[PDB]
Amino acid sequence: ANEDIVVSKTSLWKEMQYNRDITIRFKFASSIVKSGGLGYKWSEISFKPANYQYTYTRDGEEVTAHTTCSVNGMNDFNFNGGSLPTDFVISRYEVIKENSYVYVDYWDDSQAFRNMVYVRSLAANLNSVICTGGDYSFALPVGQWPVMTGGAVSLHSAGVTLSTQFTDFVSLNSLRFRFRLTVEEPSF
Amino acid sequence: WGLDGPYQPTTFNPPVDYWMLLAPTAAGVVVEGTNNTDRWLATILVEPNVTSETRSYTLFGTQEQITIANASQTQWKFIDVVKTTQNGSYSQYGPLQSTPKLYAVMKHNGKIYTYNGETPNVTTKYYSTTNYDSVNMTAFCDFYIIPREEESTCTEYINNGLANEDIVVSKTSLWKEMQYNRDITIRFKFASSIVKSGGLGYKWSEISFKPANYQYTYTRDGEEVTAHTTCSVNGMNDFNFNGGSLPTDFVISRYEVIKENSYVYVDYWDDSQAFRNMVYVRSLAANLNSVICTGGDYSFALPVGQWPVMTGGAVSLHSAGVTLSTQFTDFVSLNSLRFRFRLTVEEPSFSITRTRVSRLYGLPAANPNNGKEYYEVAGRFSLISLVPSNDDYQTPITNSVTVRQDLERQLGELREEFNALSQEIAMSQLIDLALLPLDMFSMFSGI
Amino acid sequence: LPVGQWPVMTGGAVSLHSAGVTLSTQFTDFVSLNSLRFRFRLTVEEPSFSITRTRVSRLYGLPAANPNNGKEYYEVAGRFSLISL
Numbered sequence: 001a002n003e004d005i006v007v008s009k010t011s012l013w014k015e016m017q018y019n020r021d022i023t024i025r026f027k028f029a030s031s032i033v034k035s036g037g038l039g040y041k042w043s044e045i046s047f048k049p050a051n052y053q054y055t056y057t058r059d060g061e062e063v064t065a066h067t068t069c070s071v072n073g074m075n076d077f078n079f080n081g082g083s084l085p086t087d088f089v090i091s092r093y094e095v096i097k098e099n100s101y102v103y104v105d106y107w108d109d110s111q112a113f114r115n116m117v118y119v120r121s122l123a124a125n126l127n128s129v130i131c132t133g134g135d136y137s138f139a140l141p142v143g144q145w146p147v148m149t150g151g152a153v154s155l156h157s158a159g160v161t162l163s164t165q166f167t168d169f170v171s172l173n174s175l176r177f178r179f180r181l182t183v184e185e186p187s188f
Numbered sequence: 189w190g191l192d193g194p195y196q197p198t199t200f201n202p203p204v205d206y207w208m209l210l211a212p213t214a215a216g217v218v219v220e221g222t223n224n225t226d227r228w229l230a231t232i233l234v235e236p237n238v239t240s241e242t243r244s245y246t247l248f249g250t251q252e253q254i255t256i257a258n259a260s261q262t263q264w265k266f267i268d269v270v271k272t273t274q275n276g277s278y279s280q281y282g283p284l285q286s287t288p289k290l291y292a293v294m295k296h297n298g299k300i301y302t303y304n305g306e307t308p309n310v311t312t313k314y315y316s317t318t319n320y321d322s323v324n325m326t327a328f329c330d331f332y333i334i335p336r337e338e339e340s341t342c343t344e345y346i347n348n349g350l351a352n353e354d355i356v357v358s359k360t361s362l363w364k365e366m367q368y369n370r371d372i373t374i375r376f377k378f379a380s381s382i383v384k385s386g387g388l389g390y391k392w393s394e395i396s397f398k399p400a401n402y403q404y405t406y407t408r409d410g411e412e413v414t415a416h417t418t419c420s421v422n423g424m425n426d427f428n429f430n431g432g433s434l435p436t437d438f439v440i441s442r443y444e445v446i447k448e449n450s451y452v453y454v455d456y457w458d459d460s461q462a463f464r465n466m467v468y469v470r471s472l473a474a475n476l477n478s479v480i481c482t483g484g485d486y487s488f489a490l491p492v493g494q495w496p497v498m499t500g501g502a503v504s505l506h507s508a509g510v511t512l513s514t515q516f517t518d519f520v521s522l523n524s525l526r527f528r529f530r531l532t533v534e535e536p537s538f539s540i541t542r543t544r545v546s547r548l549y550g551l552p553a554a555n556p557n558n559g560k561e562y563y564e565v566a567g568r569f570s571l572i573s574l575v576p577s578n579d580d581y582q583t584p585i586t587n588s589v590t591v592r593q594d595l596e597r598q599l600g601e602l603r604e605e606f607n608a609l610s611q612e613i614a615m616s617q618l619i620d621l622a623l624l625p626l627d628m629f630s631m632f633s634g635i
Numbered sequence: 636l637p638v639g640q641w642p643v644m645t646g647g648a649v650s651l652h653s654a655g656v657t658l659s660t661q662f663t664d665f666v667s668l669n670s671l672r673f674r675f676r677l678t679v680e681e682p683s684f685s686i687t688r689t690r691v692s693r694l695y696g697l698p699a700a701n702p703n704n705g706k707e708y709y710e711v712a713g714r715f716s717l718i719s720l
Contacts, residue, residue, distance in 0.1 A: 001568060002411055002462075003369055005367045007367060007572075008365045010578055013361050013363050015358040016354070017355040017356060017357050019351070019354065044426075083433040091428075122516040161514065162513070162514045163513055166511065465688075583693060583694070584694060587693070589679045590678050
């Protein structure tokens with residue numbers, strides 16, 4: 001096949017420019033799996049997507065927004081304290097560095113957003129943010145507990161992507177602020 | 189359109205041209221090896237500051253009295269105690285005076301080499317050894333394996349230790365919504381990354397899927413269509429095979445396998461005028477057939493011994509959703525489609541020969557294309573978009589190509605009528621109209 | 636274009652018809668070239684012109700983008716008669 005067909009007659013689109021301010025709130029999630037056995041071995045520490053919902057005000061309008069934060073290009077590190085049952089080990093833990101990306105999908109309920117469907121262009125002036133790692137203790141059966149501490153990256157807007165999910169019936173839009181990363185102090 | 193180790197104490201046959209870096213914690217025997225004919229070597233670690241005294245050590249399973257000393261007030265002393273016949277006496281050579289407490293030994297060119305001198309400026313020394321390549325070493329402490337090519341790294345360890353608003357751009361316009369149906373022949377393929385661990389050669393660190401591009405052409409109803417595809421996977425599973433903690437045990441630290449709860453995503457960008465003209469797409473649906481992806485073999489070439497072979501594995505791909513992505517950078521936009529195939533595990537299961545791993549279901553990343561140039565899927569897809577190309581009524585005044593051409597009446601013609609038309613002219617009425625200066629302006633008034 | 640698919644102007648045509656005969660003369664850096672340059676009236680012909688990837692199609696006439704269409708020259712031949720004193 002290969003055809004052109006009419007469903008509607010010609011209508012009227014004039015281009016409109018909407019200038020506004022914006023607020024992206026998001027968070028990460030993690031999955032920490034311990035190895036079975038004596039209790040000194042951890043098998044995985046990884047990032048997992050995380051959702052957040054919130055409301056903020058801008059020029060009198062109360063905006064409800066939803067975000068989903070995920071990472072890509074993460075690095076697999078490991079710590080091998082030894083091959084004995086009692087040696088602390090982490091078979092695989094993920095770390096985001098300068099070769100990684102953070103994506104934040106965004107949706108909001110604002111009237112303008114209902115408007116961004118046939119888009120000719122998008123432009124933004126976005127702040128950077130620093131994400132810093134907290135502590136995580138590894139409770140060993142016997143002995144003092146090793147603690148993972150520190151780590152930091154700053155996020156820089158690396159373009160913006162519009163995503164439209166088409167499922168069985170309708171379409172769901174989202175924005176992904178690929179953030180390119182820069183490693184920052186403190187180290188971990 | 190968008191440093192291998194640490195390994196626990198054991199006896200094994202290290203490969204030639206590798207340093208066995210030993211990390212003892214206590215004074216005493218560190219490592220020992222023999223060819224059972226003309227060479228026995230055992231390295232003993234002596235504590236700082238020891239005046240000549242006889243000590244008992246278990247060397248090759250038997251108690252031996254050895255007179256040792258360490259003149260250094262603060263550094264350890266590693267001593268090689270050697271004999272050259274089974275019942276010969278042990279003699280001392282070396283030593284290595286050390287602050288970091290690390291030593292190393294290597295089988296190379298008909299000899300056993302060990303470190304020597306005084307940290308942080310060590311050198312190496314050797315002992316000629318018949319059948320040097322088959323000497324087994326017994327480590328009595330944790331150790332690492334470093335290739336001779338990286339001897340500088342081993343030497344370093346021995347020396348030093350391990351506003352708010354609105355506005356408008358363009359004006360009023362012409363539009364028209366429209367459905368487009370087109371055949372498509374998809375073809376895609378996987379890619380893999382296989383990384384071996386450094387060291388003796390028995391350890392593999394990763395076997396993973398990586399995105400893969402493919403380009404091709406196919407015909408549908410007379411049109412030659414050029415397509416591009418990018419195949420990627422998501423939700424893969426990390427498996428591993430641990431044949432043991434010894435340097436000579438086969439291991440795969442991480443290998444990826446796609447299973448049912450998984451999806452396959454293929455990002456895409458391409459040629460054909462129709463493809464480049466996908467703009468302002470409101471809906472896109474695909475009607476395609478299904479497909480089985482089966483794993484081929486992958487051999488793991490071990491330094492010594494028969495090679496384990498990963499074989500088999502299979503999943504069938506079934507359609508899911510399609511996502512349109514538009515990447516915005518500065519001023520222009522890069523469009524792409526993301527497909528997601530759900531999976532069903534199928535026969536054959538996969539296994540790794542020469543190991544206990546067998547009859548697992550899913551498709552491993554070792555050789556997912558099984559020698560095929562591509563996997564296929566054909567069908568049709570319909571797109572519903574909107575553009576300005578339905579407009580033309582807003583085209584140009586007088587848009588006519590060629591001027592009208594109207595033949596005229598021939599000379600002879602016209603006459604024959606004038607005559608007949610005369611036969612009626614009155615008389616009196618005529619005459620008069622010959623007493624009226626019918627000049628210029630008059631004649632070309634009517635007509 | 637710096638990025639993507641290139642719009643392409645294509646088509647357009649006119650036929651030339653001898654129309655009116657005069658006088659004329661070319662002055663270059665030093666001398667003159669007497670001539671009674673004729674002027675051609677035009678009739679639009681097929682094919683019409685358009686610009687791919689855009690909103691310009693079905694227009695009649697000859698654009699200035701590539702009026703020679705790779706030809707080394709156009710040719711008009713015939714005869715002319717002169718009556719002189």
